[PDB]
Amino acid sequence: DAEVQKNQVLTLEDWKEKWVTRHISFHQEQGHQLLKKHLDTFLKGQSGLRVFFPLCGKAIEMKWFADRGHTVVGVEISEIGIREFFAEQNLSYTEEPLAEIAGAKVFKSSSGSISLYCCSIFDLPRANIGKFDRIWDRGALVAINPGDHDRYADIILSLLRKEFQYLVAVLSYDPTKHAGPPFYVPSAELKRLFGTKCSMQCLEEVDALEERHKAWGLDYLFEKLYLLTEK
């Protein structure tokens, strides 16, 4: 089952086109769901955290963290999605080109609490963005092409400070029922990618089977939230 979607891809241009065409869906209404349920364990009572959001889209959580005094950085290939974030969140921003990455740009809120890099996550190393106390990964790992898991994991690990908390959600479903994204990422895969370098705790497993998965054609859907910290 783990290899069923192994050769399935969406390309960077495919993702940009989903945004252009409005063929992208955001079923996230109050933010996420198990978002706030575990925010306290994630923050571990600290202030002024530097928090990275891979494949951030226009995630409202980025504004929640910024509102609370944390420094937020996101990466998102779609310029359209990034601009929608600032619009939806009613925030002004600047645009600057990225020297190290052809055609790339960074969009930053006017007082700097949110910086959204418009480029591929795989190009981020060249942008010299430093490291992070926290990484928030909802939808990102499960959006990555299965073939690119190791490349993604390596980048994630390279962006972590020595002490960190990395919150990552994965989805369990029958991979023969649905060609991703989101892709099927079993616990075994999360372990393969991060277990050498991170301690792993399952915080919660919930039954996520609902409405729109009627045309997805799924008999079951579980989402598991994991908290990864230094070994």
Could you list the residues that contact ligand SAH (CB under 6 A)?
12, 15, 19, 28, 55-57, 59, 75-78, 81, 120-122, 138-140, 143
Q: What is the DSSP code string of 52-90?
A: EETT-TT-THHHHHHHTT-EEEEE-S-HHHHHHHHHHTT
Q: Is residue 18 part of an annotated ligand binding site?
A: yes
Strand 114-118 and strand 71-75: pairing?
A: parallel
CB of 94 to ligand SAH, least distance (A): 20
CB of 29 to ligand SAH, least distance (A): 12
Closest to ligand SAH by CB, 116 vs 160, is: 116
Closest to ligand SAH by CB, 70 vs 138, is: 138
Q: Is residue 23 part of an annotated ligand binding site?
A: yes
Is 204 in contact with 161 (CB distance < 8 Å)?
Answer: no
DSSP state of 43: H
CB of 221 to ligand SAH, least distance (A): 16
Is 34 in contact with 169 (CB distance < 8 Å)?
Answer: yes
Q: Is residue 126 part of an annotated ligand binding site?
A: no
Q: Is residue 22 part of an annotated ligand binding site?
A: yes
Q: Is residue 17 part of an annotated ligand binding site?
A: yes
Strand 105-109 and strand 114-118: pairing?
A: antiparallel
Closest to ligand SAH by CB, 84 vs 205, is: 84
Closest to ligand SAH by CB, 45 vs 175, is: 175
Closest to ligand SAH by CB, 11 vs 230, is: 11
User: Whole-angstrom Cα distance, residue 4 to residue 177?
Assistant: 10
CB of 75 to ligand SAH, least distance (A): 5
Residue 143 CA, chain-centre distance (Å), reads 8
CB of 25 to ligand SAH, least distance (A): 9
Q: Is residue 16 part of an annotated ligand binding site?
A: yes
Q: Which residues contact 172 (CB under 8 A, 6 or more apart)?
A: 184, 186, 220, 221, 222, 223, 224
Q: Is residue 55 part of an annotated ligand binding site?
A: yes
Query: SS3 for 7?
Result: coil
Binding residues: 15-26, 55, 76, 120-121, 138
Which residues participate in the annotated binding site for S-adenosyl-L-methionine? 15-26, 55, 76, 120-121, 138
Binding residues for substrate: 26
